[PDB]
Write a protein that binds this ligand. Sequence first.
Ligand SMILES: NC(=O)CCc1c[nH]c2ccccc12
Ligand SMILES: NC(=O)CCc1c[nH]c2ccccc12
Lengths: 300, 237
Amino acid sequence: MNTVPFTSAPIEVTIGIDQYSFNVKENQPFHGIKDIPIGHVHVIHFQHADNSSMRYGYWFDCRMGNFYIQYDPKDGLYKMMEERDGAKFENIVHNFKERQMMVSYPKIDEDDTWYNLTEFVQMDKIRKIVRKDENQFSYVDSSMTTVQENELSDPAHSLNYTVINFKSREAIRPGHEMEDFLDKSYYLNTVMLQGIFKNSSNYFGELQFAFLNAMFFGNYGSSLQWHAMIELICSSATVPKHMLDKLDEILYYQIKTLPEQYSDILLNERVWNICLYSSFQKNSLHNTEKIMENKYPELL
Amino acid sequence: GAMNSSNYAELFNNDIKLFVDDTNVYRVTVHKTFEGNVATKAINGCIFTLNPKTGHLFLKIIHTSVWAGQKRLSQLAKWKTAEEVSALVRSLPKEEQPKQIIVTRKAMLDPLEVHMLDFPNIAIRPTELRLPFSAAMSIDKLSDVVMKATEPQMVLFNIYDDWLDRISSYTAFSRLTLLLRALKTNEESAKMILLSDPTITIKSYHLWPSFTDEQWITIESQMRDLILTEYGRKYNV
Ligand SMILES: NC(=O)CCc1c[nH]c2ccccc12
Ligand SMILES: NC(=O)CCc1c[nH]c2ccccc12
């Protein structure tokens, strides 16, 4: 079990760690989060009490280094940092634990939610979508735009998701215009899976990361990416059976975790109605269709 | 953006553009079978592709053999339309290619956009105008070449005859849309108006009769009367 030490908490802030959150008061003696499960990526995120604008946070994996949070009064945010002196970091954490100034990652033993949301998410792939090679962790916030959004303005601060565009030469083989537009199997299986992602695990990892950035930061370009990657599968008549079964599980847990009060903005009516009721895969997502109909029948 | 009443004069500027109407591409008769079920029999169709500035008509005849063994024909017809329009554009010299293609039915937007991906600078636009181009098969010479075709064939006609020698494109398009609207609303009456006087003939290379300027004014008034009436006879007013 790993730990992320905070220097201090000088400004009042709601701190999230994965799907959990807690409020910290201005100058409250808070010194970080312990008992973080090893084996998964994690995200630690922030919303200041004064400016609910800009949710922001850091994707990280404690197996890759010792990370801590320290507030910067100049840039006005809680920053993640790496401590390279392992003995300096073990000593700091040990003292804070002895003084019981850390909250414990509040995982219930029966609960596989975070695993299910991050099953295919890898830190190495996150670091290619979010390019800042000098750090082992990745910053994301509400406002960052995607490469595709930019093409349609600072490249260093963009989300480099894989561009998917159904009306593009990459998606449409000359001479197969109607075939490829109405059945996207060649774009899914040859262009994207065999060509770009290499395998379905990397495809699902980007899909899962896009959803999590949409949910935790309200990142609009990430929501677009998540829906595009769903629609590309559902609009393919030919999809490996293991991928369809896995997609149903992935989406089920995403829909299960989504805050009810955010479904209006985070769920695209056209995509979901098309995918569950019109698409080639309308009968292949049984768990997802059941949870959607019982939790968000209005959208449908 | 969409072409509408507000930006109508854009049709007659010097940027080459084409209307595409797919109404008459997939044409059928519905009939009963011996067992008493219903079936369709395709008849030859056409793509109506028109330069509204010059009157240039590129009438691509769609022979019934293109439907043989195919499913979902109404969907296929839109894609076949887009394939043929794209092939026409590629066949034209660069300086004769359109800068915009205006589709008369919004369901043609995605098929045409996908077929024209190689031409990113040609704008594909819908329209809010309810244009009467479906009535093109009420023009006798056009209907005749479509029905007689035994294979796929492109036939080039000027739909304005020689009108542009005496009137502007705006006035020519307005006359064409008036004639076609009349033919669509009451074909028999419209055709009676156009042919009532036997001494005004249709030249061999023309589609419409050789009316003088004064006779076109009378004809146009007759077509407007017909359209207003039928709008009574229909709504009882
Ligand atoms: N004691 C300090 O130097 C505060 C900042 C700091 C440096 N390295 C760290 C490692 C873990 C937590 C905090 C820190
Ligand atoms: N290629 C073009 O730009 C026009 C071709 C064309 C179609 N219909 C016509 C009628 C009269 C002269 C020319 C034509």
